[PDB]
Design a protein around this nucleic acid. Structure first.
Ligand SMILES: [Mg+2]
Ligand SMILES: [Mg+2]
Ligand SMILES: [Mg+2]
Ligand SMILES: [Mg+2]
Ligand SMILES: [Mg+2]
Ligand SMILES: [Mg+2]
Ligand SMILES: [Mg+2]
Ligand SMILES: [Mg+2]
Ligand SMILES: [Mg+2]
Ligand SMILES: [Mg+2]
Ligand SMILES: [Mg+2]
Ligand SMILES: [Mg+2]
Ligand SMILES: [Mg+2]
Ligand SMILES: [Mg+2]
Ligand SMILES: [Mg+2]
Ligand SMILES: [Mg+2]
Ligand SMILES: [Mg+2]
Ligand SMILES: [Mg+2]
Ligand SMILES: [Mg+2]
Ligand SMILES: [Mg+2]
Ligand SMILES: [Mg+2]
Ligand SMILES: [Mg+2]
Ligand SMILES: [Mg+2]
Ligand SMILES: [Mg+2]
Ligand SMILES: [Mg+2]
Ligand SMILES: [Mg+2]
Ligand SMILES: [Mg+2]
Ligand SMILES: [Mg+2]
Ligand SMILES: [Mg+2]
Ligand SMILES: [Zn+2]
Lengths: 293, 159, 105, 202, 117
RNA sequence: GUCUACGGCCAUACCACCCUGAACGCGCCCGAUCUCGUCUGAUCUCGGAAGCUAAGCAGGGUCGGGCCUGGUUAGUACUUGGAUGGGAGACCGCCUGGGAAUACCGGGUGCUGUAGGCUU
RNA sequence: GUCUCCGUAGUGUAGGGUAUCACGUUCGCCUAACACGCGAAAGGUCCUCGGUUCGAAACCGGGCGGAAACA
RNA sequence: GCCCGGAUAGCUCAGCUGUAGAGCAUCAGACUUUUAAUCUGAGGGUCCAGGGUUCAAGUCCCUGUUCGGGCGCCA
RNA sequence: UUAAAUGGGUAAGAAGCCCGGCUCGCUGGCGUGGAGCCGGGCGUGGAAUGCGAGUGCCUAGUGGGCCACUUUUGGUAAGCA
RNA sequence: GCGCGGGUAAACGGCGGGAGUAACUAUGACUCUCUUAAGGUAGCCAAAUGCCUCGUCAUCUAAUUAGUGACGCGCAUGAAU
RNA sequence: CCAGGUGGGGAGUUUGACUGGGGCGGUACACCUGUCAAACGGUAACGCAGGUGUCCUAAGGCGAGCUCAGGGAGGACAGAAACCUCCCGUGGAGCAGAAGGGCAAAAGCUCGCUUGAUCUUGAUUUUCAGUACGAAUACAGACCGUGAAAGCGGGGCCUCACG
RNA sequence: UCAUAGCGACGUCGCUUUUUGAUCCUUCGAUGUCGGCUCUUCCUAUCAUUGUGAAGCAGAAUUCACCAAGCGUUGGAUUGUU
């Protein structure tokens, strides 16, 4: 009885609800319509999107195009699926982003029957490489990077996935600005610290430095590096072999697992009869407690 | 008397439907518009670009051109003395597909497959659509129930 | 309004976007040998008084501001003119206003 | 300064209320709408009588001023000052304009306020004791003569000013689907939360 | 005053510096915060007049300003409300109420609150 | 039966409070050398994996509030066309067809596309 | 009739952030005493009423008035 | 459109590339039988604004702001 | 918020539908897409009712209107506007 | 020639307003000021000149919006207009 | 003889329109919003409520980041209002102006960079007689800007701001 | 004292064309325009006179109503005046 209430009946009655995904805050519809909408005078040509997402544990990478029923996705990459060859520890980092981008590139190219042509960059390096179509061959695949809500700042892992793609053989337009090799004040691209971050010298030097400063903070930091005995060295060749295996076979297969039952883990919505019984027996219990006195 | 602005008398015309303000649903964007397909003109107000003039709202036309963000359509506009064919350009979100021609085409396709099936089976079949003919004299059962007797209820001045 | 003294823009001669110096256009003096002026002098000659209309109405308040712009490039100094909408108070290259100040002491 | 009411009898000018456009409106002569024992709760005044007019006329505010004063005077003289409650149901929202003494710019200045009624429209409303019906009938009868049209007087079947019928009202409040709240009542649907039920019925 | 002036100046402090400055102030108050300084959302804070006593000593240049602390609290996870992606509410029983502010106060600083006034 | 990424529709999905959450998962969480930012690693960015569902999230709960859909209001209000209908008018009745919206009382409360995981 | 302006210490006067001054009365100094002078005190709910905003004599709406100006 | 003349204590005007002055002023002091009257002081330049020549600008030069005038007039 | 009646637009086929096949310098992962084009098969003529239509040229007079049911603006009202 | 400067009203014309002030009150001889440069002096008046106006007072008659005499903040009298 | 001045002494000519008769008064004379307007559109009156002859090197063009009006709870001076923090907040603020529409990781605010307010041909819409002007919409061709990119931008979110 | 002998506030329903308005239908190839003088007739919403009713009608005088327009409704000063 002090202040007028805000969330009253009328406010709800005229409140408007945003889109489901906007309310969950998972899709910026402004930029989404900005990215995915194909021109009108093409009518069937899908504007492919390289969708990259940062997960506290994983890295999501997929190539999608939207239709009326929803988005159509041709192929996807998963950092949790990455260790099935090559690297086994150090996921959801920049090196992981580049590797999984290259993996997605290669598996798209294979499932397009196109992997042989447009090798991309077999040799990994931090400089600029943008693929070109070759005459007499099917046109080079192009797509754009669907950054999403992530703050696209120079040196963001999503750009690492983009570099993995462009080295893989995808023509994604991009300036040479948002990479570790770029210098802001000097407007220059070093292109060597960039490949250092791409391959992992950026965490390699840090974790090798961390030896002589500490050991137990070392333990609490790279605990899964201690297991697998992941040395600061011997961390170049295994990334190389990861890339080699990416080149060899990027195809992905599931695991046949059908032995499950219908053990419902939730509870269903009770029917009207249950609500009526509940309210009536609550009525009986209340009236009984009162007549008890 | 009144002015001749491009959007006079469109206060309630271009208002968003209640509980529908805000970002346009994206589905209406990637609808695929051919040439010669039939569309109607709505003119959503939240986009102020490519606006059709107030007259064309709520009329149906056929597309004669297609561009990056709009389509060229032909609509018959009634001038005072006669009706003229106008070619106008409107950004996509102001127009929708028209179900009239779609329903006609569905009926036509059913007619074509009916034509196919009636041929070899040898029986003569009906094609046109008739306008609700007379109603086929029939019986109504009683089951021994007495038709209840109505009687107007008496006038009372409630208020 | 305020407009910078120089600006990069498209120049027809060199066919790209070049830096240009702007200046408020000023109407030149009548030739007094051009055809129409000369016909006017011949007509006003002799008797008959004023043989042509005199506007003397002035329903407009201001003028369309015309900016004479020329490409700074040393080889080509072609001068094009662009027109700005009407304005009461015009100014060339004043200080750039900036929002975050005490307005005023 | 006030024209005859027969000039402004008919509602024919597209209801034109006081608004931001209608500025400089003379203050209405009606200010007091509910009279009598307004504190009376729900039962002490069971009978409800209404004046109802079957005509689409606009009624001048001063007319209902005179009518209300007359009804109050009869009530206080005859039924006593405590044993009735007076409520009118019209508000002169419509604004009437007059053009003063050619007719260039004939749109005149507002000078009064009138209220518009329809065929079934209560004007006066009285809740009082049951044995006061003969009193109230005469009270509304004398009140009618202050009104331009011809009106019907009707004893409301409902319990007083409540929107509910008088016959079922006592039981209705007994089984607690209804509660008294000041002059009026509060209908209680059985679709809230059980706490709102359980606070009462106990 | 007039708008767009430079009226106030502040900082936001978190971590070891935050708790040590808070304890510094509380010792300046000898840990007595009396009745209703706590805010119902859970947070609180107080003002003082003389900063020289503790901490840094007087310099004749600087003057005799007071100031006002307003320390805010929280449980691990509260940053979800400020997170850019998938922002959301925090839930009722995860929130903070005044009632437990004094409880944790006395649990940590043995300060005195709610005199019988 | 679910969950994750991308969604379509945009409250049956929203909001409030309560309870349950196995496995993956998503998170919360730790740290700031590098990338990057701020006043502050709070956000943003980067590097991790000691701990936790508490929060978010998902499911369910509420004689919940809404929202959706019904009956009701009601063949009422209103209205196409007709009368040498009534009435002083105000308006009303009739023929002809069409035909609503509160209140009040019921029911329901997210479906679904692609891609990818868990669940004896 | 319309329109414009204005309603304040006894009297007249100016004037959102607690009504100024002059005279009117009382008043106390000075003087031998008066006069004169000076000083203070008292003194107007700012025409009434409704609203507006933290608050209104002020701002906005009415009602009265008074005064012109048109008619 | 051209030629221009002036904007400075509350008011007007002189003026030093060199610390703005004179008055009409405002207020206060002496001065006085009081008032006049007499002086004295303090304070007061919407130095028309922006610049620039500049060591150095009220002045010198532009740019505008007005104020004023005297001239010219085919959209 | 909801929302009539009356009303405005469109469609109710042979210029349509379906099969092949070619061209493109636009588009493009792709035989893409799209458009254009050449052939081929389709007839129960794809609602009612009525009616013969289409098209070209010259051109007078007129450009003060008023009234009737109904809707409606100003006005007290008007054989008022 | 126009401007700038004198002179000129028996030249055309003009003769307003605000403050402050006297032992009832009132007015203001007096002091100051504004807008163009003065601010109606001597005189005369409801006049052939006064809307308000049938101004008011006296007289004239039974009765006078007429007449005369008188008063003058005179809408809007007035000195070779 | 030519030039400049003076020159109602004299000459020629003009001295708008709409208008509940005209005159005075207003502009219903070019425009824009809401209503009148009777649910496509069109629709008069000296019908009503209003507005315009501008303003903006950014108040334009991009991109990033934020959320506003208001309220609640607090915290020295500090209260009805100064400032900070937390909570609620469908927008109830702001977007130059009149009004209407539209707008929330927007079209609002703060920043980084910029001149797409540029150079060209046609088409269409708007009043329309389907003339013009103005304004506007889609393109197409250069040359650019911005962004990582998708794209977006050839002035102002749209409805007026002009020959 | 007493609502209504006589009056009637707040409201409300009308009648008249003797005011003044609003409109501009008739006449601008003209209907002579203010007032007065004279003269006739008509109207009643009756001032008097006939006959009536009512009163706060003792008489006198007066007021309010009904049938009622047959009859009568003046002489002068001032003003062009109504
Ligand atoms: Mg973005
Ligand atoms: Mg209109
Ligand atoms: Mg309008
Ligand atoms: Mg409308
Ligand atoms: Mg020429
Ligand atoms: Mg009358
Ligand atoms: Mg009307
Ligand atoms: Mg509910
Ligand atoms: Mg009907
Ligand atoms: Mg008419
Ligand atoms: Mg007419
Ligand atoms: Mg005199
Ligand atoms: Mg006189
Ligand atoms: Mg005379
Ligand atoms: Mg005589
Ligand atoms: Mg005389
Ligand atoms: Mg002449
Ligand atoms: Mg319409
Ligand atoms: Mg219509
Ligand atoms: Mg944005
Ligand atoms: Mg670009
Ligand atoms: Mg272009
Ligand atoms: Mg625009
Ligand atoms: Mg006439
Ligand atoms: Mg005539
Ligand atoms: Mg004739
Ligand atoms: Mg005659
Ligand atoms: Mg009679
Ligand atoms: Mg006789
Ligand atoms: Zn050039």
């Amino acid at each position: 009885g002090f202040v007028k209430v805000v969330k009253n009946k009328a406010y709800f009655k005229r409140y408007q609800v945003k889109f489901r995904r906007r309310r969950e805050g998972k899709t910026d519809y402004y930029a989404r319509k900005r990215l995915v909408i194909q021109d009108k005078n093409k009518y069937n040509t899908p504007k492919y999107r390289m969708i990259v997402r940062v997960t506290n544990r994983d890295i999501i990478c997929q190539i999608a195009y939207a239709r009326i029923e929803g988005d159509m996705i041709v192929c996807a990459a998963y950092a949790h699926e990455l260790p099935k060859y090559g690297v086994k520890v150090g996921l959801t980092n920049y090196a992981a982003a580049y590797c999984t981008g290259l993996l997605l590139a290669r598996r798209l190219l294979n499932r397009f029957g196109m992997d042989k042509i447009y090798e991309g960059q077999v040799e990994v390096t931090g400089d600029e490489y943008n693929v070109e179509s070759i005459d007499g061959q099917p046109g080079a695949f192009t797509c754009y990077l669907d950054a999403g809500l992530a703050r696209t700042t120079t040196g963001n892992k999503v750009f690492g996935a983009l570099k993995g793609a462009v080295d893989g053989g995808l023509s994604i337009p991009h300036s040479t600005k948002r990479f570790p090799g770029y210098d802001s004040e000097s407007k220059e691209f070093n292109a060597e610290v960039h490949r250092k971050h791409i391959m992992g010298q950026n965490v390699a030097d840090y974790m090798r430095y961390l030896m002589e400063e500490d050991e137990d903070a070392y333990k609490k930091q790279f605990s899964q590096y201690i297991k697998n005995s992941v040395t600061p060295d011997m961390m170049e060749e295994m990334y190389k072999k990861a890339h080699a295996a990416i080149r060899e076979n990027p195809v992905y297969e599931k695991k046949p697992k059908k032995e499950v039952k219908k053990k419902r883990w939730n509870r269903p919505k009770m029917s009207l009869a249950q609500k009526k019984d509940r309210v009536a027996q609550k009525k009986a219990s209340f009236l009984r407690a009162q007549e008890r006195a | 008397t009144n002015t001749k602005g491009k959007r006079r008398g469109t206060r309630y015309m271009f208002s968003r439907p209640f509980r529908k303000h805000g970002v346009v649903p994206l589905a209406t964007y990637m609808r695929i518009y051919k040439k010669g397909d039939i569309v109607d003109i709505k003119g959503m107000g939240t986009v102020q670009k490519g606006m059709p003039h107030k007259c064309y709202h709520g009329k149906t036309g056929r597309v004669y051109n297609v561009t990056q963000h709009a389509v060229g359509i032909v609509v018959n506009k009634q001038v005072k003395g006669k009706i003229l064919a106008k070619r106008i350009n409107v950004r996509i979100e102001h127009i929708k597909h028209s179900k009239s021609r779609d329903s006609f085409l569905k009926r036509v396709k059913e007619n074509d497959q009916k034509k196919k099936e009636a041929k070899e089976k040898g029986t003569w079949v009906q094609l046109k659509r008739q306008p609700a003919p007379p109603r086929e004299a029939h019986f109504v059962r009683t089951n021994g129930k007495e038709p209840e007797l109505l009687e107007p209820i008496p006038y009372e001045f409630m208020a | 309004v305020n407009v910078p003294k120089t600006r990069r823009t498209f120049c027809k001669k060199c066919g790209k976007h070049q830096p240009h110096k702007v200046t408020q256009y000023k109407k030149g003096k009548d030739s007094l040998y051009a055809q129409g002026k000369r016909r006017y002098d011949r007509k006003q000659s002799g008797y008959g008084g004023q043989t042509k209309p005199i506007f003397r109405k002035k329903a407009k308040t201001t003028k369309k501001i015309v900016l004479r712009l020329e490409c700074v490039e040393p080889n080509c100094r072609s001068k094009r003119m662009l027109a700005i909408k009407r304005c009461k108070h015009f100014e060339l290259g004043g200080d750039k206003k900036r929002k975050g100040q005490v307005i005023q002491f | 300064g006030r024209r005859p009411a027969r000039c402004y009898r008919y509602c024919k000018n597209k209801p034109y209320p006081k608004s931001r456009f209608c500025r400089g409106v003379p203050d209405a002569k009606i200010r007091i709408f509910d009279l009598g024992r307004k504190k009376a709760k729900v039962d002490e005044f069971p009978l409800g009588g209404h004046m109802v007019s079957d005509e689409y006329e606009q009624l001048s505010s001063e007319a209902l001023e005179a009518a209300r004063i007359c009804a109050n005077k009869y009530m206080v003289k005859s039924c006593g000052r405590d044993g009735f409650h007076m409520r009118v149901r019209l508000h002169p929202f419509h604004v009437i304009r007059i053009n003063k003494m050619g007719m260039r710019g004939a749109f005149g200045k507002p000078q009064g306020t009138v209220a518009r009624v329809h065929i079934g429209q209560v004007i006066m409303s009285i809740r009082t004791k049951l044995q006061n019906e003969e009193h109230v009938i005469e009270a509304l009868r004398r009140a009618k003569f202050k009104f331009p049209g011809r009106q019907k007087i009707h004893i409301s079947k409902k319990w007083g000013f409540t929107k509910f019928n008088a016959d079922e009202f006592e039981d209705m409040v007994a089984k607690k689907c209804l509660i008294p709240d000041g002059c009026g009542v509060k209908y209680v649907p059985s679709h809230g939360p059980l706490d709102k039920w359980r606070v009462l019925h106990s | 005053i007039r708008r767009n002036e430079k009226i106030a100046v502040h900082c936001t402090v978190r971590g070891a510096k935050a708790e040590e400055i808070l304890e510094k102030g509380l010792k300046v108050r000898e840990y007595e915060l009396r009745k209703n300084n706590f805010s119902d959302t859970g947070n609180f804070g107080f003002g003082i007049q003389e900063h020289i006593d503790l901490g840094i000593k007087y310099d004749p240049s600087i003057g005799i300003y007071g100031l006002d602390f307003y320390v805010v609290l929280g449980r691990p996870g509260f940053s979800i409300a400020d997170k850019k992606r998938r922002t959301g509410c925090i839930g009722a029983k995860h929130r903070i109420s005044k009632e437990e502010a004094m409880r944790w106060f006395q649990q940590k600083y043995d300060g005195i609150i709610l005199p019988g006034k």
